[PDB]
Amino acid sequence: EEGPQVKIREASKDNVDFILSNVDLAMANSLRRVMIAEIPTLAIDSVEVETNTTVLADEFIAHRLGLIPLQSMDIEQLEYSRDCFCEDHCDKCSVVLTLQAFGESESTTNVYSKDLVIVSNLMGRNIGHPIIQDKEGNGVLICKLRKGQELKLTCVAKKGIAKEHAKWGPAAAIEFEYDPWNKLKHTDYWYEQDSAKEWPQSKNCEYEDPPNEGDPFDYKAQADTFYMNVESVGSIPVDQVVVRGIDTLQKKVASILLALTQMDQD
């Protein structure tokens, strides 16, 4: 384009390994922070338990229910329950999905995330569906029932930010590394004998030029090349994770700009 540059090294459904070029450190860091916390996601926020004769406690189940990864593709055309003009929740803000399990066989009856059944009206929006990256197609193991144990409950999932609770986290671990050769000298290495033989060599070293001992210290150098690897949980695709991250940062900057526009009022 004209500004910052991206170089996708590896790409898959769950991970994106790329190189951010021509960017300030603070912008990369902020992008990381936004990707971690400030990205809207659909997750269980309300749990109504009717019958619960399982081993686990009520809120013990409700907790892991909250951590269940739900489809958050069209989450942007869903709304916050705190913003909607409805009582409690509705179809324009929340997604209601039920859970009815009961011990049938003599063996242990497992209760997975696939047993969750959407009840509310999605009206077209791709949302609410629990992510199943499981090979057998079961999903997250929620609970276990004996012979006559029953678990009947209802879940109201709402739009939320990971800043409010980690269950709304769209991404897992974000790999982040700049200057693999310590040419900026942002780090004074610890050692007992040899500094280089003890400390392992980064992979990203393959993508930069090693320093020459004949060359002095480059004091007028900054941080331009960043090596990142963004991993998604399933609620939001990796590309959409980083893109909605960027758009979120941009938007919350635009809100400050808008605030500056508004403070000119008499």
Binding site: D14, V55, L56, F60, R64, L67, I68, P69, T108, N110, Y112, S113, I131, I132, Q133, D134, K135, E136, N138, G139, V140, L141, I142, C143, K144, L145, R146, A166, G169, A171, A172, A173, E231, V233, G234
Partner: protein, 65 residues
């Protein structure tokens, strides 16, 4: 109790990888390390999350009430 749904440290889903893990230990007769590696648990925090966990719910289901 039961396998934690997601890893504490990072946030990776590990609750769907319990049973499989067990299989990789008894069906394919692998060691814990390789089993954890095959499930896509490269970071040692999630690797911990599964390796360190004890499934107590099985002993809990032994009661009739």
């Amino acid at each position: 109790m039961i396998v934690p749904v997601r890893c504490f440290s990072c946030g990776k889903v590990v609750g769907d990888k319990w049973e499989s893990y067990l299989n990789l230990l008894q069906e394919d007769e692998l060691d814990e390390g390789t089993a954890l590696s095959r499930l896509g648990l490269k970071r040692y925090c999630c690797r911990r999350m599964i390796l360190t966990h004890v499934d107590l719910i099985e002993k809990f289901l032994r009661y009739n009430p």
